[PDB]
Design a protein around this ligand. Structure first.
Ligand SMILES: Nc1ncnc2c1ncn2[C@@H]1O[C@H](COP(=O)(O)OP(=O)(O)OP(O)(O)=S)[C@@H](O)[C@H]1O
Lengths: 865, 181, 177
C-alpha cells in the first residue's frame, strides 16, 4: 500500500530479471518470472487463489511467454518501462487488485494473476487462475489480504489467519513504538543463548507478573532482528498471540486450535524467522486442560518451530508437576526482581518516555526515591511496574496539576477568570452606567496585565510544549531516523543511513541543543517556563500518599533514622513506663532497620510482661512506632493444638483442603505487611512442634506456602513473649532489676522450656513493677489522650485533673493483677457515665472543665459542669 | 566446535557431584547441552568485536558529511573530516579483511563442520543401506570412501586450528572450555 | 455491486413504477432518490450528497423525478419495475469504485461511485444523478471501508453513519437536558 512491498505477479513481470532480452514489455505480464514453476512457492504459481478449479497448467509457458519469452527489447531497458498488452494495461495492472475480489494492485496469491491483466490471452481462450473475478473461489487463500499497506508481502502466505495468527511487534519494532526498556539482559542473552539449544529447547521464565518481558525479550530479539545472534536464532523470529484466537477467534472449539495447528504447518516449512509467542500454558491447559492446541506440539515439537512462553512463580511449580514429559521438551529458567538502582536505571530510562507523552520534567531524584517508599507503601503490586505506576501517578499527579493547562490559572480560573466573569457577568442588569448597584466593569482594568501573563503562562507550558513537542519528537524521530539510519545498519549496511544521517544527528540535536537551551523564564523555576509546570514530586508523592493511606508529612518527613534516632527518646514520650526495654529494643530497633549484620534476620525479645500491661502497650507503641500503623496487628493462637495448624500454620495444605488461603489468612497479612513485628503469647503454652513450626520462623523465617511461597524477614519482625513467670512476676519486692533472680525464671523457663533454638534467637526482655508515682501520671495520659481523638470541637478541654480521683483512680489504679490496664473502661465508664448526664444536658458545650468532689469511699464522682 | 574430553568427563563428575539430582546422563546431557550453550553465542561471530570495531564507521561515518557542512575553522572541518575518515578508512582495514578471515575460516570451520555434519549423515544413510541387505551394504559404503573424508576433516580446520591468530587461534575458541562454561 | 441491504432505496424503483407497474421502469428514478427522508434523500439531503452532492438539494431531482415511471399501460397487478438498460448500469460500476477500502462487497455508494451517463431527472453537470462529487467520491471523501455486514441502507450509499443506538453525552445536556 506504499511501495517496494511486493507485486505478486506484477513484481515478477519485468522484474524477474533486470535486462537481458528486454522481456519486461510484452502482451502478458508474466515475463521476468512466471509464478516460479507450476505451484506457488513464489508469485501466483500453479494452483493458487487464481483458482482451485481454474488455473494455468501450461500457463507457465503461456503466461510468461506472452509475458516475455524475451528478446522484444533492443536494450536492457529496451522500452520505456515494459509496455505491452498487459504491460500498457498497467493502468489495470494495479487494477488487477482494483475492482472487487482483488486488493489495491494485487496481494497475497491474488498478487499473482490479476495484476498480469492480459496474459495467456488478454482474456480470450484459456483456463488460468483469476484476480478479482476468476479468483472468487480462490479468494480464500490467494485472496484474503484485506491489509495491503505497511507490511511486506514476501512469502506467499495466502489465506492463513494472519492478524489473528499473532503479532510480531518487530513490526512495532519496525515502528519502534514499543519501549526499549532494558538492562536485565544476560538472562535473556543466556535465554537467548539458551534459546539456541538443540535437543531440548525453548526456555521460558518468570518472576513478577504481567507486562510481558517478551517484547522485552523481543527487544534484543529485535536487536536480534538487528541480528545480535548467530544465523539460526538470528534467522528466527516470532509473532504474538495466545488469546486472541480464543473463543472469539473461532465460533466454538475444533478449528479453534486447529487452524493454528494447521497454521503451524505453514510456518514449519523452510520458513526462517519463525518462533512462537506464548505467555502462559497457565492460560493454557485448564480445569479440563484443553490440550489447547498444545500437547500435540510437544509431539510436533519433533520437527521445528520453537516458541516462547512465561512461567509464573509458585504456580509454575503447580505447572511443573503436571507433566515433565511435557516439560521434557521446553527449557525453563526464571526471573529476579530488580529494584532501586536497577529501577533507577528505568527511572532514569523512563523520564523521557512519558515526558515523551505527558511532557513534564521533574528533578525527579527524590521522586525516584519516592518509589521505594511508595514501593514499600503498596508493594504487593509489581515493584517496578508498580513503581512504574507511580510514574503514572506522577503524571497523574501532574495531569492533576495539569487538567486543562498545568496548574496555575485553571486554579486561578477560580479567581482571574471568575474575575473575568466580573469583567463580563454583570454587563447588563437594570442599569449600569456610572453610579449604580451594577459592579461589572472594574475588573477589566486590572486582570488585563494579569490575564495577559496568562498568555506567557499559557505559552509557558505551551510554547515550551511547542518546543517540547519537537523535544519529544526530536530524538523520537531520530529514534525513527537513526533507526531509519539503523534501517539497515545491522546488515553491515552503512552509508544509506549515514546519507540522511549526515548532519541529521548534528541538526536535530543541534535544534535540541538550540532549543533545549531555551528558557524564557524570568527566572521562573529552572531553565524553562512550565515543564514541571510547577510540579513537585513530593507533593504528588504526597498525593500519592494522599491517595495511598494519606497520613502524610511524616511521610514527607523521612529521615527514618533521624526520625527514629530521636523517636526512642521520643516514643519514650509515648512510652508507658519501663524504659530500657525501649532502650534495649531501641538498639534492636536501630539495629533493626539498620540491619547491616544479616539480610535475613529480625529480632525478638523475651519481653517479659504483664497482661495488657505494657504488653499490649508495646505492640501498639511498637506498632505506633514503625509508622502510625495500627493495621500492623499480628498474633497467633493454635499454641492450642496437637496436630492442627493449617490456617494456623501458614501452609495449610495444598489445594484440596479447608480454604485455599493456606495461611493466606496469616499470609495475605504476611503479604499485606512486608514490615511488622509479631508477638503471640501462649508461646509459653505453645504447641512445641508448632514451635518447630515456629522454628523456621526465625532467620529462615522465610515463608513456605501450601503453594510454595517464601518470605524473608527482618522485613516484619517478632517479639513473641509470655509471662509464664510468677516468682519474679509476682516478686513484689524488686521491680526494675532487683536480682538475678531475674535470670532464674528467665534462665530456666527458656532453657527449661525451650531449646538451642532460642540460643539462635534474639533478645531477652521483661517488664518491671510499677511505682504508683510512675504509675500515677500515666493516668491522664490515656485520659488526656481521650478528648484528643474526638472529631468535633466545642468543649475539648482539660476538666478534672489535679489529684482528686487520680488517687481514687490510683486506689483503683494498678491492682496486683492489673486493676490498671482495664481501668480505661472502669475509668471511662465513670467518665462516660458523668459526661453522659451532662452530654445529656450539656449545660454549656464549652465551659465545662471541672474536677470531681468525689460511698464509704467518700467518692462516686460526677461533676458540676 | 572442537572438544576437549577430560573436562566433559570431569565436568560430568562434579556436574553429577555439584548437581546430583540430574540423573547420571542428564546432568551431563545438561553439560552437553550447556556446553553448547556457553558455546552458543560464543559462536556468535565476534559479538564484542562485532559491535566494538564496527563503531569506527559510525564514529567517523556521520562526520564524513556532517563536517562537510559545519561551523568550524575553515577547511580544518574538512581536515578533521579527512583525517578521521583517514583513520576510519585505515583502521577499518587492519581488521577489514581480518574479521572475515576469522569468520571466513570460521565458515571454513563451519564449512568443514558441515562436512563433519555431512560425513556421518551419509555414513548413517550408508549403513542404512545395510537395510538394503548386502546389496547396498558395502557398495555405497565403499563409494563414501573415507580414506580421506576425515583425513579431509581433521587436516582441514587443522590449519586454522594450527594457525593461531596471535594466540589461541579462534576467539571463537570453539572447543571445550574446560570448566569455565 | 450495490449490496444485500439495497431493498429500501432499491425498493422505490417499482415504487416509481407504482402508478401502474411497468414492463420495466428505468434507472432514471427510484424512492432511493427520496431514500428514507422526505426532502433531498439521505445522501443528497445530508448523508453523502448533502453538502457536495450537486443537484437535487431537497426537491431538485426527486420533486419532478416521478414523471418517467408514472402510470402503466395495462397493469391490474402484472409487474412492477426493472432496470433493463440500467440492469447492467451499475453492475460493474457497483464493484469498480470500491478499490481497497478495507471492506467486503459491492457498494451502493460504491454503485454511487460513477453515477450514470444519463439516468435521472436533473441537468447538473451531466444526465447523471444529483450533480457531482457524491457517491463513491463523496462517500470516499465522506467515509471509507464502512457500509454494513452483508448489506445496508436500501437504494443509495446509506444514511447510516454512527453506531445505531447512541446515548448522548455532548449534545445530551448541551441543552441542559
Ligand atoms: N529494563 C527495563 N527498563 C525500563 N522499563 C522496563 C524494563 N523492563 C520492564 N520495564 C517496564 O515494565 C513493563 C515491561 O513488562 P514487564 O512487566 O517487565 O514484562 P513481564 O514479563 O510481564 O514482567 P512482569 O511479569 O510484567 S513484572 C513496561 O511497562 C516497561 O516500561
Amino acid at each position: 500500500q506504499f511501495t517496494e512491498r511486493a507485486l505478486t505477479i506484477l513484481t515478477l513481470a519485468q522484474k524477474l530479471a533486470s535486462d537481458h532480452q528486454h522481456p519486461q514489455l510484452q502482451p502478458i505480464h508474466i515475463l521476468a518470472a512466471f509464478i516460479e514453476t507450476p505451484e506457488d512457492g513464489s508469485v501466483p504459481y500453479l494452483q493458487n487463489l487464481i483458482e482451485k478449479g481454474r488455473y494455468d497448467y501450461d500457463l507457465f509457458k503461456k503466461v510468461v511467454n506472452r509475458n516475455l519469452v524475451r528478446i522484444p527489447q533492443q536494450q536492457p531497458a529496451p522500452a520505456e518501462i515494459t509496455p505491452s498488452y498487459a504491460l500498457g494495461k498497467v493502468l489495470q495492472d494495479a487494477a488487477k487488485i482494483q475492482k472487487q475480489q482483488k486488493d489495491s494492485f494485487i496481494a497475497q496469491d491474488h498478487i499473482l494473476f490479476a495484476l498480469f491483466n492480459d496474459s495467456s490471452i488478454q482474456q480470450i481462450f484459456k483456463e488460468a487462475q483469476v484476480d478479482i473475478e476468476a479468483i472468487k473461489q480462490q479468494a480464500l487463500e490467494l485472496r484474503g489480504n484485506t491489509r495491503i499497506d505497511s507490511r511486506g508481502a514476501d512469502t506467499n502466505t495466502p489465506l492463513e489467519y494472519l492478524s489473528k495468527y499473532a503479532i510480531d511487534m518487530t513490526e512495532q519494532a519496525r515502528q519502534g513504538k514499543l519501549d526499549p526498556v532494558i538492562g536485565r539482559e544476560e538472562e535473556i542473552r543466556s535465554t537467548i543463548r539458551v534459546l539456541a539449544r538443540r535437543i531440548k529447547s525453548n526456555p521460558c521464565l518468570i518472576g513478577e507478573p504481567g507486562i510481558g518481558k517478551t517484547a522485552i525479550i523481543e527487544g534484543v530479539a529485535q536487536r536480534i532482528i538487528d541480528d545480535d545472534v548467530p544465523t539460526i536464532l538470528q534467522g528466527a523470529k516470532l509473532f504474538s498471540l495466545d488469546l486472541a484466537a480464543l473463543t472469539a477467534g473461532a465460533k466454538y472449539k475444533g478449528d479453534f486450535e486447529e487452524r493454528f495447528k494447521g497454521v503451524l504447518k505453514e510456518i514449519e516449512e523452510s520458513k526462517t524467522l519463525i518462533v512462537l509467542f506464548i505467555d502462559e500454558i497457565h492460560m493454557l491447559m485448564g480445569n479440563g486442560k484443553d490440550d489447547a492446541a498444545n500437547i500435540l506440539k510437544p509431539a510436533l515439537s519433533r520437527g521445528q518451530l520453537k516458541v516462547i512462553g512465561a512461567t509464573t512463580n509458585n504456580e509454575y511449580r503447580s505447572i511443573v508437576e503436571k507433566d515433565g514429559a511435557f516439560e521434557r521438551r521446553f527449557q525453563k529458567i526464571e526471573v529476579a526482581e530488580p529494584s532501586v538502582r536497577q529501577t533507577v536505571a528505568i527511572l532514569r530510562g523512563l523520564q523521557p518516555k512519558y515526558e515523551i507523552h505527558h511532557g513534564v520534567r521533574i528533578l525527579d531524584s527524590a521522586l525516584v526515591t519516592a518509589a521505594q517508599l511508595a514501593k514499600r507503601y503498596l508493594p504487593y503490586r509489581r515493584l517496578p511496574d508498580s513503581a512504574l505506576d507511580l510514574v503514572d501517578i506522577s503524571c497523574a499527579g501532574v495531569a492533576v496539576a495539569r487538567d486543562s493547562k498545568p496548574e496555575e490559572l485553571d486554579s486561578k480560573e477560580r479567581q482571574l477568570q471568575l474575575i473575568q466573569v466580573e469583567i463580563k457577568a454583570l454587563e447588563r442588569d437594570e442599569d449600569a452606567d456610572s453610579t449604580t448597584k451594577d459592579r461589572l466593569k472594574l475588573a477589566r482594568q486590572k486582570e488585563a496585565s494579569l490575564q495577559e501573563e496568562l498568555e506567557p503562562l499559557r505559552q509557558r507550558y505551551n510554547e515550551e510544549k511547542h518546543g517540547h513537542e519537537e523535544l519529544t519528537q526530536a530524538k523520537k524521530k531520530l529514534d525513527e531516523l537513526e533507526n531509519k539510519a539503523l534501517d539497515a545498519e545491522r546488515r553491515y549496511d552503512t552509508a544509506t543511513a549515514a546519507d540522511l544521517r549526515y548532519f541529521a544527528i548534528p541538526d536535530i540535536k543541534k535544534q535540541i541543543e538550540k532549543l533545549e537551551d531555551q528558557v524564557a523564564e524570568e527566572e521562573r523555576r529552572a531553565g524553562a517556563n512550565s515543564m514541571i509546570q510547577n510540579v513537585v514530586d513530593s507533593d504528588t508523592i504526597s498525593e500519592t500518599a494522599a491517595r495511598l493511606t494519606g497520613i502524610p508529612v511524616k511521610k514527607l518527613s523521612e529521615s527514618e533514622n533521624e526520625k527514629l534516632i530521636h523517636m526512642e527518646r521520643d516514643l519514650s514520650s509515648e512510652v508507658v513506663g519501663q524504659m530500657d526495654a525501649i532502650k534495649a529494643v531501641s538498639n534492636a530497633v536501630r539495629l533493626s532497620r539498620s540491619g547491616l549484620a544479616n539480610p535475613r534476620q529480625p529480632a525478638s525479645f523475651l519481653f517479659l510482661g504483664l497482661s495488657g500491661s505494657g504488653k499490649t502497650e508495646l505492640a501498639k507503641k511498637v506498632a505506633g512506632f514503625l509508622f502510625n500503623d495500627e493495621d500492623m496487628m499480628i498474633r497467633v493462637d493454635c499454641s492450642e493444638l496437637s496436630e492442627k495448624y493449617a490456617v494456623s500454620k501458614l501452609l495449610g495444605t495444598t489445594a484440596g483442603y479447608v480454604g485455599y488461603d493456606e495461611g493466606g489468612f496469616l499470609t495475605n497479612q504476611l503479604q499485606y505487611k512486608p514490615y511488622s513485628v509479631l508477638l503471640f503469647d501462649e508461646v509459653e503454652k505453645a504447641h512445641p512442634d508448632v514451635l518447630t513450626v515456629m522454628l523456621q520462623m526465625l532467620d529462615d523465617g522465610r515463608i513456605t506456602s501450601g503453594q510454595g511461597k517464601t518470605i524473608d524477614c527482618s522485613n516484619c519482625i517478632v517479639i513473641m513473649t509470655s509471662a509464664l513467670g510468677a516468682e519474679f512476676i509476682n516478686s513484689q519486692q524488686g521491680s526494675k532489676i532487683q536480682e538475678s533472680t531475674k535470670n532464674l525464671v528467665m534462665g530456666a523457663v527458656r532453657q527449661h522450656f525451650r531449646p538451642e533454638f532460642l540460643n539462635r534467637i534474639s533478645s531477652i526482655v521483661i517488664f518491671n513493677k510499677l511505682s504508683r508515682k510512675a504509675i500515677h501520671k500515666i493516668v491522664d495520659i490515656r485520659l488526656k489522650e481521650i478528648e484528643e481523638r474526638f472529631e468535633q470541637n466545642d468543649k475539648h478541654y482539660k476538666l478534672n485533673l489535679t489529684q482528686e480521683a487520680k488517687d481514687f483512680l490510683a486506689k483503683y489504679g494498678y491492682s496486683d493483677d492489673m486493676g490498671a490496664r482495664p481501668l480505661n473502661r472502669l475509668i471511662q465508664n465513670e467518665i462516660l457515665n458523668k459526661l453522659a448526664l451532662r452530654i445529656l444536658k450539656n449545660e454549656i458545650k464549652d465551659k465545662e472543665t471541672v474536677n470531681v468532689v468525689l460511698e464509704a469511699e467518700e467518692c462516686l464522682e460526677v461533676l458540676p459542669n
